[PDB]
């Protein structure tokens, strides 16, 4: 049995707010640790809060 998760929730709601993780400014930022969402949730910054 499967429904919605909770990582997907705040990921989708944070990507609703203009963020991104791949092509953020113009450079390829997939590997850069201060941009993908899992680090923003483990650091748990002002934004996810």
């Amino acid at each position: 049995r499967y429904t919605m998760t909770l990582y997907d929730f705040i990921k989708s709601e944070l990507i609703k707010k203009g963020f991104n993780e791949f092509v953020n400014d113009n450079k390829l930022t997939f590997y850069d640790d201060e941009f993908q969402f899992m680090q923003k949730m483990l650091k748990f910054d002002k934004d996810v809060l």
């Binding site: 997907d8 929730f9 989708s12 709601e13 990507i15 609703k16």
Partner: peptide, 27 residues
């Protein structure tokens, strides 16, 4: 047979359905 989910991908669509269940959101 042998039901596999051969794609496993990433999405970019967003959700807060202000609703009690799936059902009431369909309504």
């Amino acid at each position: 047979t042998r039901e596999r989910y051969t794609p496993f991908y990433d999405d970019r669509a967003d959700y807060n359905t202000n609703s009690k269940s799936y059902y009431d959101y369909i309504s």
